[PDB]
């Protein structure tokens, strides 16, 4: 968690140097942190982060699958 947050902070900090590259780096780091929150059983934060990613990057399939997996874990199979 500490390292993922530092990576997000660093990508944000040095985004002006290259916004395009650092945006993609932050997208992957953000997905990692959401997966971690899932690991730490913070499924609300993980779900919010997955939805935040999907809102801006609707082509990130893994976020859809993680939301579905969390829903399945909840027991909501539909």
């Amino acid at each position: 968690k500490k390292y993922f947050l530092a990576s997000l902070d660093r990508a944000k900090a040095e985004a002006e140097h290259d916004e395009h590259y650092y945006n993609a780096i932050s997208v992957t780091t953000s997905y990692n942190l959401a997966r971690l929150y899932e690991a730490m059983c913070e499924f609300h934060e993980a779900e919010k982060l997955y939805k935040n990613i999907l809102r801006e990057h609707p082509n990130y399939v893994d976020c859809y699958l993680r939301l579905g997996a969390m829903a399945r874990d909840k027991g909501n199979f539909y």
Partner: peptide, 24 residues
């Protein structure tokens, strides 16, 4: 011919799809 009611099943259940953190 009496015993604990339990049907023994030899199961081969695949693991869930891995979703490990991605490396950049």
């Amino acid at each position: 011919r009496s015993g604990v009611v339990c049907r023994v099943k030899y199961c081969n259940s695949l693991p869930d799809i891995p979703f490990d953190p991605k490396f950049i």
